[PDB]
Ligand SMILES: Nc1nc2c(ncn2[C@@H]2O[C@H](COP(=O)(O)OP(=O)(O)NP(=O)(O)O)[C@@H](O)[C@H]2O)c(=O)[nH]1
Ligand SMILES: [Ca+2]
Ligand SMILES: [Mg+2]
């Protein structure tokens with residue numbers, strides 16, 4: 755069956771693991787355990803196609819980010835995640851996109867910009883700001899909450915739909 759290799763990247767603490775775990779395991783991880791490099795695999799039907807998602811959950815903490823580029827290298831599509839209550843994580847997106855372009859040696863990599871923790875009210879990144887960033891990259895912006903599940907399936911499936919357009 756069709757396999758899609760997805761890679762989730764972004765600053766430490768933005769909720770990359772919580773998003774992936776909500777998608778794959780249907781629960782919310784409340785605690786914060788920094789990730790090194792974890793992978794998840796699940797068979798799902800997306801738009802009538804049975805496919806296998808291989809999701810690489812990467813480190814956002816600089817300390818844990820050792821061979822991250824070697825992992826990212828294999829990815830077919832990337833979720834670039836920031837948190838809507840973490841302005842620095844949004845500003846950091848530029849450098850993740852540059853890293854993706856570097857590891858794929860392409861200016862045209864399937865990507866979706868994700869603004870996570872949308873269940874929280876300490877918003878410092880407004881939707882329009884993120885929409886504009888994504889527009890400049892030619893990719894979709896989607897807000898999510900790993901806590902409530904809002905947008906979670908949408909984000910990951912939209913990434914599959916972007917890979918399919920390339
Ligand atoms: N309220 C809320 N909290 C969230 C959300 N997503 C993640 N969190 C919380 O944010 C903290 C960090 O989440 P985590 O998924 O571990 O972040 P990460 O990006 O994978 N961190 P790292 O890069 O170090 O591996 C956790 O305490 C988690 O519960 C969300 O959508 N809403
Ligand atoms: Ca929990
Ligand atoms: Mg993590």
Ligand SMILES: [Mg+2]
Pocket residue numbers: 855856857858859
């Ligand atoms: Mg390269």
Ligand SMILES: [Mg+2]
Pocket residue numbers: 878
């Ligand atoms: Mg502002």
